[PDB]
Design a protein around this motif. Structure first.
Motif, PDB file in Angstrom:
ATOM      1  N   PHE A 241      -9.445 -28.888 -11.766  1.00  7.36           N
ATOM      2  CA  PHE A 241      -9.312 -27.434 -11.726  1.00  7.36           C
ATOM      3  C   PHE A 241     -10.197 -26.794 -12.788  1.00  7.36           C
ATOM      4  N   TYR A 242     -11.254 -26.120 -12.345  1.00  4.69           N
ATOM      5  CA  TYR A 242     -12.252 -25.578 -13.259  1.00  4.69           C
ATOM      6  C   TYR A 242     -12.358 -24.061 -13.168  1.00  4.69           C
TER       7      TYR A 242
ATOM      8  N   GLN B 212     -14.405 -22.075 -11.670  1.00  5.69           N
ATOM      9  CA  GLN B 212     -14.611 -21.556 -10.309  1.00  5.69           C
ATOM     10  C   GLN B 212     -13.287 -21.438  -9.569  1.00  5.69           C
ATOM     11  N   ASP B 213     -12.451 -22.460  -9.713  1.00  8.18           N
ATOM     12  CA  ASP B 213     -11.172 -22.526  -9.018  1.00  8.18           C
ATOM     13  C   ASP B 213     -10.241 -21.392  -9.446  1.00  8.18           C
TER      14      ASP B 213
ATOM     15  N   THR C   3      -9.096 -24.966  -5.851  1.00  7.19           N
ATOM     16  CA  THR C   3      -9.052 -26.339  -6.342  1.00  7.19           C
ATOM     17  C   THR C   3     -10.377 -27.070  -6.161  1.00  7.19           C
ATOM     18  N   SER C   4     -10.641 -28.017  -7.054  1.00  4.18           N
ATOM     19  CA  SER C   4     -11.802 -28.887  -6.941  1.00  4.18           C
ATOM     20  C   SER C   4     -11.336 -30.322  -6.738  1.00  4.18           C
TER      21      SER C   4
END
Ligand SMILES: Cc1cc2nc3c(=O)[nH]c(=O)nc-3n(C[C@H](O)[C@H](O)[C@H](O)COP(=O)(O)OP(=O)(O)OC[C@H]3O[C@@H](n4cnc5c(N)ncnc54)[C@H](O)[C@@H]3O)c2cc1C
Ligand SMILES: Cc1cc2nc3c(=O)[nH]c(=O)nc-3n(C[C@H](O)[C@H](O)[C@H](O)COP(=O)(O)OP(=O)(O)OC[C@H]3O[C@@H](n4cnc5c(N)ncnc54)[C@H](O)[C@@H]3O)c2cc1C
Ligand SMILES: Nc1ncnc2c1ncn2[C@@H]1O[C@H](COP(=O)(O)O)[C@@H](O)[C@H]1OP(=O)(O)O
Ligand SMILES: Nc1ncnc2c1ncn2[C@@H]1O[C@H](COP(=O)(O)O)[C@@H](O)[C@H]1OP(=O)(O)O
Lengths: 261, 263
Positions: free
Chosen positions: A206-207, A209-210, B206-207
């Motif tokens: 979770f970064y 961007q998220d 989410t990634s």
């Protein structure tokens, strides 16, 4: 312009005034803030990078974002020390630097600047960053809010815009320029809002961007309704997810600025 | 033994034999596979990197070398390298632009070898098992490894000629068209289906990255590393490290088995 006023063939000889550990002990990073005396001769705009030539007089320069505003006597940069112990070429150089050591810079580089009438127009901003990517935003804030370390108790600011910052770091001891960030946040709570996104929470990744994605509507609101000038500095990935949100005009693309490394 | 045979002071003059687009149209990336003739003079072990000095000649005096993982095996006449072309705005990275502009039969100057991201010295004889973890151009040294282990020969692909350990590959890329060395990887999976298993993690979906896939199946990864005495390799993004390591953590002799090269 101030671009390429100094090159690897005629760099500016400067002096280290200070060298400060930018992170706190729970950080797995090693980052130094350097205060550099350039005799008023290094010319730059907020957002510009400088080149440092390690061990100058291989003649190879590295770019570093300037973390100070134009009005300040000395300039500053934040340099993460890369390790694999062996160090990165410049990394090793900055590590063994001593106060009052010589350091050679190359003339302003890049175009990651503020719109030239930002204070007049009170233009609104979205600043997105990871790691040392916060540096140019710190230079931006120092200008917009007329920051002065020796005169913090006065304001001083004619800027009435709204700035939203999204900042991804490992943990809170890894937040760079926390002193400044917390200061601006306290002094101008109606002008600035900051969301920190810590990667340690994971172990799904979770970064930054998220987080933008989680706040899609709110993020879209700011860019559309408040005509925010949008900046991205840090991880190259940030781009796609954030660009996608916007897509989902040419007049718009001039409002987007990207510097990834 | 081979480390630093060539330096920025005495780089080895080589020739470009081929220059190949490694990705397919749906990829947002640009990456070139370089075949390089070094006249048998460049010495390296699988896993090593070489340095390339952009714009070197016998302009200015910028000797600024970049490291690139060798994707060929020792026994091959020429050596391989896969280079992603970095862009901003278009403008190019320093070496990226030099490679971009490279022509067939141009001079290119190498330093090396460098690094210690190498196979165990008896891997084939002991039939040792592996877990390779990669992102982007991080698959390169694994291609080198596979070419040595499976006796890869482009001009004799119809022969078996191989090692009988088990290799598990976790490879993160943007999409299918971004898989580097897909030809070889598909050839290994077809020819040695009982000796290799490849898991692809596409970021376009989410990634969710390569470590997350591994964390998704952490018990099986644990079982592979512990029950099969796997040598664990990690090449690519620095972040991969901690998520993977933690599962392993929850030591003294097991750290000899783990290898990491991040960039
Ligand atoms: C526009 C721009 C702005 C930037 N702004 C900043 C900034 O504000 N702050 C900042 O800290 N950085 C910034 N950077 C990055 C910075 O310029 C350097 O790239 C960074 O400091 C690493 O340089 P280095 O010489 O120390 O590492 P290098 O010697 O160039 O090596 C690069 C990486 O490879 C690794 N490496 C080197 N040799 C080996 C080896 N033999 N084996 C395995 N790994 C190896 C190193 O650990 C390092 O992480 C910016 C970059 C750009 C393009
Ligand atoms: C051990 C190791 C193995 C490696 N193996 C490989 C490999 O197999 N394949 C591979 O492709 N790479 C590999 N790398 C990385 C490689 O060495 C280079 O770092 C990469 O090619 C980028 O180099 P460059 O000179 O083209 O970019 P640089 O000029 O050094 O710049 C670095 C980045 O910053 C950007 N940039 C530069 N200047 C500016 C500017 N003025 N404004 C904004 N952005 C700027 C560039 O676009 C680039 O993305 C490896 C690294 C290490 C440490
Ligand atoms: N693909 C990515 N997109 C956005 N942020 C990332 C990505 N990979 C790592 N990060 C995060 O950016 C922050 C600064 O990284 P760095 O110190 O390398 O500049 C860290 O929190 C790091 O998380 P992580 O802890 O997974 O590395
Ligand atoms: N922190 C991270 N950990 C693991 N993989 C990552 C991270 N950040 C990016 N990646 C992915 O690694 C792959 C190779 O990237 P590169 O092309 O830079 O070598 C891409 O799919 C990229 O996804 P993304 O599309 O989010 O960048």
């Amino acid at each position: 312009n101030f671009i390429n006023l100094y090159t690897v063939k005629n760099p500016l000889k400067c002096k280290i005034v200070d060298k400060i550990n930018l992170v706190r002990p729970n950080s797995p990073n090693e980052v130094y803030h350097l205060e550099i005396n350039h005799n008023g001769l290094f010319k730059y705009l907020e957002g510009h990078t400088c080149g440092i030539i390690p061990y100058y007089n291989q003649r190879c320069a590295r770019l570093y974002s300037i973390s100070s505003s134009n009005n300040m006597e000395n300039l500053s940069v934040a340099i993460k020390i890369h390790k694999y112990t062996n160090y990165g070429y410049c990394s090793g150089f900055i590590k063994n630097l001593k106060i009052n050591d010589d350091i050679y810079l190359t003339g302003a580089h890049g175009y990651f600047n503020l719109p030239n009438d930002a204070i007049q127009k009170n233009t609104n901003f979205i600043f997105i960053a990871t790691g040392t990517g916060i540096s140019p935003y710190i230079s931006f804030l120092k200008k917009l809010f007329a920051y002065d370390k020796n005169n913090l108790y006065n304001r001083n600011s004619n800027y009435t815009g709204y700035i939203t910052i999204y900042y991804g770091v490992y943990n809170e001891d890894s937040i760079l320029y926390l002193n400044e960030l917390e200061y601006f946040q306290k002094m101008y709570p109606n002008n600035i809002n900051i969301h920190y996104v810590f990667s340690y929470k994971q172990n799904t990744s979770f970064y930054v961007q998220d987080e933008i994605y989680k706040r899609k509507t709110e993020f879209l609101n700011l860019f559309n309704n408040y005509k925010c000038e949008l900046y991205i500095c840090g991880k190259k990935s940030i781009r796609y997810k954030v660009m996608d949100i916007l897509k989902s005009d040419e007049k718009k693309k001039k409002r987007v600025h990207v510097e990834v490394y």
